[PDB]
Amino acid sequence: RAEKFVAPGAVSSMFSPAGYLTELYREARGLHPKDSDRNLDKRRQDL
Amino acid sequence: DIQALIAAEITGRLPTPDVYNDDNKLVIPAINTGGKITFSELAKTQSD
Protein backbone atom coordinates (compact mmCIF):
# COMPACT_ATOMS: atom_id res chain seq x y z
CA ARG A 1 0.00 0.00 0.00
CA ALA A 2 3.14 2.13 -0.52
CA GLU A 3 3.72 2.74 3.18
CA LYS A 4 7.51 2.42 3.54
CA PHE A 5 10.15 0.92 1.27
CA VAL A 6 13.80 1.04 2.27
CA ALA A 7 17.02 0.94 0.29
CA PRO A 8 18.93 -2.25 -0.46
CA GLY A 9 21.54 -2.58 2.24
CA ALA A 10 19.52 -0.71 4.85
CA VAL A 11 19.35 -2.26 8.30
CA SER A 12 15.56 -1.90 8.34
CA SER A 13 15.12 -4.24 5.37
CA MET A 14 13.63 -7.70 5.57
CA PHE A 15 16.52 -8.99 3.46
CA SER A 16 19.22 -7.27 5.50
CA PRO A 17 21.82 -9.16 7.51
CA ALA A 18 19.98 -7.79 10.54
CA GLY A 19 16.85 -9.65 9.46
CA TYR A 20 18.89 -12.78 8.79
CA LEU A 21 20.50 -12.48 12.21
CA THR A 22 17.08 -11.99 13.80
CA GLU A 23 15.75 -15.11 12.07
CA LEU A 24 18.88 -17.02 13.05
CA TYR A 25 18.88 -15.97 16.71
CA ARG A 26 15.15 -16.66 16.97
CA GLU A 27 15.56 -20.18 15.63
CA ALA A 28 18.76 -20.71 17.64
CA ARG A 29 17.99 -19.52 21.17
CA GLY A 30 15.84 -22.52 22.12
CA LEU A 31 18.00 -25.46 21.10
CA HIS A 32 19.55 -26.08 24.48
CA PRO A 33 17.66 -25.58 27.76
CA LYS A 34 18.26 -22.54 29.92
CA ASP A 35 19.76 -24.72 32.64
CA SER A 36 22.41 -26.01 30.24
CA ASP A 37 25.89 -24.57 29.83
CA ARG A 38 25.68 -25.12 26.07
CA ASN A 39 22.77 -22.70 25.68
CA LEU A 40 23.39 -19.78 23.34
CA ASP A 41 22.10 -17.14 25.75
CA LYS A 42 24.31 -18.38 28.57
CA ARG A 43 27.62 -18.73 26.73
CA ARG A 44 27.15 -15.35 24.98
CA GLN A 45 25.48 -12.68 27.10
CA ASP A 46 26.13 -10.04 24.44
CA LEU A 47 23.65 -11.28 21.83
CA ASP B 1 22.26 14.05 -0.99
CA ILE B 2 19.77 16.41 0.63
CA GLN B 3 17.94 13.51 2.29
CA ALA B 4 21.24 12.44 3.83
CA LEU B 5 21.57 15.99 5.18
CA ILE B 6 18.09 16.01 6.71
CA ALA B 7 18.59 12.50 8.11
CA ALA B 8 21.95 13.39 9.65
CA GLU B 9 20.25 16.51 11.03
CA ILE B 10 17.50 14.57 12.83
CA THR B 11 19.29 11.40 13.98
CA GLY B 12 22.96 12.35 13.63
CA ARG B 13 24.80 15.35 15.04
CA LEU B 14 24.32 18.26 12.63
CA PRO B 15 24.66 21.27 12.81
CA THR B 16 28.05 20.69 14.39
CA PRO B 17 29.02 21.46 17.11
CA ASP B 18 26.11 23.17 18.88
CA VAL B 19 22.41 23.24 18.01
CA TYR B 20 19.38 24.60 19.98
CA ASN B 21 20.88 28.13 20.03
CA ASP B 22 18.09 30.32 18.61
CA ASP B 23 16.39 31.93 21.65
CA ASN B 24 16.33 28.66 23.67
CA LYS B 25 14.35 26.92 20.92
CA LEU B 26 14.89 24.30 18.21
CA VAL B 27 13.12 23.16 15.05
CA ILE B 28 13.65 19.54 14.02
CA PRO B 29 12.18 17.96 10.86
CA ALA B 30 10.19 14.77 10.48
CA ILE B 31 9.77 13.27 7.01
CA ASN B 32 7.08 10.74 6.10
CA THR B 33 6.00 8.60 3.07
CA GLY B 34 8.88 9.98 0.95
CA GLY B 35 6.96 13.08 -0.06
CA LYS B 36 6.51 15.44 2.89
CA ILE B 37 8.58 16.98 5.68
CA THR B 38 6.67 18.06 8.79
CA PHE B 39 8.09 19.94 11.76
CA SER B 40 8.01 19.92 15.56
CA GLU B 41 9.77 22.31 17.91
CA LEU B 42 11.39 22.41 21.35
CA ALA B 43 11.47 24.97 24.16
CA LYS B 44 12.59 25.31 27.77
CA THR B 45 12.21 27.24 31.01
CA GLN B 46 14.94 29.47 32.44
CA SER B 47 17.12 27.54 34.87
CA ASP B 48 20.88 28.26 35.30
Task: Describe this protein's structure.
With 47 residues, chain A is mostly helical. Chain A has 2 helices and no strands. The longest helix of chain A has 12 residues. The first copy, chain A, is elongated and about 45 Å long. The chains hardly touch.
* SSE class of chain A: mainly alpha
Q: What's the β-strand tally of chain A?
A: 0
Oligomer: part of a larger assembly
- Indicate the proportion of strand residues of chain A: under 5%
H and E string of chain A: HH
- The general outline of chain A is elongated
Reported for the largest beta sheet of chain A, the result is: none
Q: Helical proportion of chain A? A: 25-40%
Task: State the distance separating the first and last CA atoms of chain A.
Answer: 34 Å
> For the CA atoms, what is the radius of gyration of chain A?
15 Å
Number of helices of chain A: 2
List keywords for this structure.
membrane permeation; 47 residues; toxin; mainly alpha; 0% strand; part of a larger assembly; 2 chains
Would you kindly provide a brief summary of this structure?
Chain A is mainly α. Helices cover 34% and strands 0% of the residues of chain A. The N and C termini of chain A lie far apart (34 Å).
Write the layout of secondary structure elements.
The structure is cut from a larger assembly and holds two copies of chain A.
Chain A: H1 17-28, H2 40-43
